[PDB]
Amino acid sequence: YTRVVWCAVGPEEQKKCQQWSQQSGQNVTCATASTTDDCIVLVLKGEADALNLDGGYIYTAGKCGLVPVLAENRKSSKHSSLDCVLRPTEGYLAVAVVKKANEGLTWNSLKDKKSCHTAVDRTAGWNIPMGLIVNQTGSCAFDEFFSQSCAPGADPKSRLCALCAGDDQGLDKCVPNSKEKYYGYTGAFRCLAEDVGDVAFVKNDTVWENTNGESTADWAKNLKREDFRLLCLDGTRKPVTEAQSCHLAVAPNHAVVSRSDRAAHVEQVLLHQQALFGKNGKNCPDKFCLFKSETKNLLFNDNTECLAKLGGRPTYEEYLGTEYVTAIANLKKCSLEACAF
Ligand SMILES: CO[C@@H]1O[C@H](CO)[C@@H](O)[C@H](O)[C@@H]1O
Ligand SMILES: [Fe+3]
Ligand SMILES: [Zn+2]
Ligand SMILES: [Zn+2]
């Protein structure tokens, strides 16, 4: 029984963590850092215990000895009778999204266009699309493919940050945290929605959750699913209803990681925390909901049903899968066995 120290990325996550801390009676406390990489370092030092990470960061964390503990699980069809916490995760679909009005724009004509990315090093926003582009062009100059982009985490003076906007005051341009207007799934989709970019690399869920009244955010309230198309690898364009036949890859779900020596303790505390503040928790929506933050995906994705046990006690490599690990390794050769910190 000790507290678990969660690592929040940026000021907005910090605020949500503080609410969680208060409601949990200090069983969970908060450490804050400006980037995901800095949070990983805090965990390695033992100054923080855990945080929830996209697959691209699990790769970084894994090389440094951190392990997956529990995974985000969202609504599913198969394995219907089984409880959420025990149900296998299905993974999400990485897609490339454009405006219907941008006619004749296909996977094969993306060169020199404007792109919107969740963040550098993330699965749907970066690793998958850039990995595919590097291959198809046979060049490590992915910094040269698009004319301008917003890829949070890149050099703020480079073309890869040209479209990023910063915070209400125009500060923190291109920072890889929610202070940057176009950061993350929602941010990259907004970058496309506002016609700042020509293409957004996000997941299939992002399109649905931010269209047809699903989001009441000022920029999203008038967005219609029909005004968007997905780019398929075969050069065609399809409606967003066809994601199962028109995606770039299937990605492993975001997951909670911790130091191996702390895994058992983190797992215990989190399972109890979700019984109190999760999907149908004792205190949600009454007092506090761990999986809500108004489409902002703070700490956890808003569409998370529960955190699920893994099973087979997988290493980070088995969790990510050989097909994804080799993809990252090859892309990493552009810009092999050691912790990068
Ligand atoms: C997509 O499923 C994954 O496949 C890889 C094989 O690369 C395994 O290591 C892992 O446990 C999972 O079953
Ligand atoms: Fe992701
Ligand atoms: Zn597929
Ligand atoms: Zn194993």
From Swiss-Prot:
Poly-N-acetyllactosaminic carbohydrate moiety seems to be needed for TLR4 activation. Glycans are attached at residues 27, 135, 204. Disulfide bonds join 7-39, 17-30, 64-339, 84-306, 116-191, 140-334, 150-164, 161-174, 232-246, 284-289. Residues 4-333 form the Transferrin-like domain. Fe(3+) 2 binds at residues 54, 92, 185, 254. It is found in: Secreted; Cytoplasmic granule. Belongs to the transferrin family. Monomer. Found in a complex with LTF, CLU, EPPIN and SEMG1. Found in a complex with MPO and LTF; interacts directly with CP, allows Fe(3+) incorporation into LTF and activation of CP ferroxidase activity. Transferrins are iron binding transport proteins which can bind two Fe(3+) ions in association with the binding of an anion, usually bicarbonate. This is Lactotransferrin. The gene is LTF. The chain holds residues 361 to 705 of 708 of the full protein.
